[PDB]
């Protein structure tokens, strides 16, 4: 429990400095390539750290689209493509020209 507190303090400082440095890079208040390259590394991690959450939550929360909506859009494209007479794309023939 002591370790976890300090890791969260290091964490908060680490992310909060990523935010501050990126506002400098957006505004143009910094012209040091190492600061930008550092900060991109931090933000890449902060993205993935949240993307791993998003991919896990999907399997936990299930399909965010209802089965109602999914069959609605599915049937809609069938009615479209049927009325367009769309012939579906075959697999590339063995001797295709």
């Amino acid at each position: 429990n002591m370790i976890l507190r300090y890791v969260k303090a290091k964490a908060d400082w680490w992310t909060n400095s990523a935010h501050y440095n990126r506002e400098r890079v957006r505004r143009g208040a910094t012209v040091d390539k190492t600061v930008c390259k550092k900060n991109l590394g931090r933000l890449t991690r902060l993205y993935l750290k949240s993307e791993q959450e998003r991919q896990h939550n999907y399997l936990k929360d299930g399909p965010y689209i209802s089965a109602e909506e999914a069959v609605a859009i599915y049937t809609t494209t069938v009615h479209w493509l049927e009325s367009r007479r769309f012939s579906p794309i075959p697999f590339p023939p063995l001797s295709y020209k």
Binding site: A67, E68, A70, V71, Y74, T75, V78, E82
Partner: peptide
């Protein structure tokens, strides 16, 4: 739900084709 929609859609298209040709 998508598998049954696949069933329903395929035979609807076939019947509307069979009624045309």
């Amino acid at each position: 739900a998508l598998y049954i929609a696949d069933r329903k859609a395929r035979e609807e298209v076939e019947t509307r084709a069979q009624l045309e040709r």
